[PDB]
Amino acid sequence: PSCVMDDFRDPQRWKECAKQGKMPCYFDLIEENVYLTERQCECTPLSKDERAQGEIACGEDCLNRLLMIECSSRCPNGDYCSNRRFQRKQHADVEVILTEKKGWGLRAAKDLPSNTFVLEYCGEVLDHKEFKARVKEYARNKNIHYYFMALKNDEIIDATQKGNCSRFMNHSCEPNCETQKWTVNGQLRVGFFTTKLVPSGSELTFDYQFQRYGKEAQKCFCGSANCRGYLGGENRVSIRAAGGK
């Protein structure tokens, strides 16, 4: 079974597709990070001719791109700025698929060039108090999958209840994606980017570098020759540590 991202826009149909096991369980689809408690480049503007020639606005040499900052609407290249991927939701062509043992996952629907933006990891941003509260709730409920992503010291992203299809990217000890933290509007966001050419049909993975606070570690089924056997690796850390101190 597989589904495209558009399938998640229709809740009623998503829900009944889920009853027949045709789509993953329902969660709240959001366009950007939601906080539980709240807290310009020097590119030379492309001519119309360069635009027509296929020149890239704010490409490799953009001072903002280089520091992993997105441009605003006030960018010198304006509409044509190619450095506003997070804000324009310019995700890769990706599908959500049911895997053998890891639950649902992500898969390339087209070839994906190296260093291609895939999706933003959206969710509810928690502080330490909120994180601890949800650690308990998720344990009480006996959740299997976990969706905590460290953003900064007092900010963890939690896509358990709210997020987008990025919450489906499985771990691999030998992955074809990575996280990159991007500054968007003075706020930090995390997004997945490919680390290499990913052929169409290939599953999309990143290395969790998982900080396990659980008593028992989950077994990893990535199937790599360098697989570490478990998510979190050898060590178990405290709750506060996983949570960023």
Added chain:
Amino acid sequence: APATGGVMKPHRYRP
């Protein structure tokens, strides 16, 4: 207490 659980940690890929 928690039987399972953990936090994913962003890092740049390095071979």
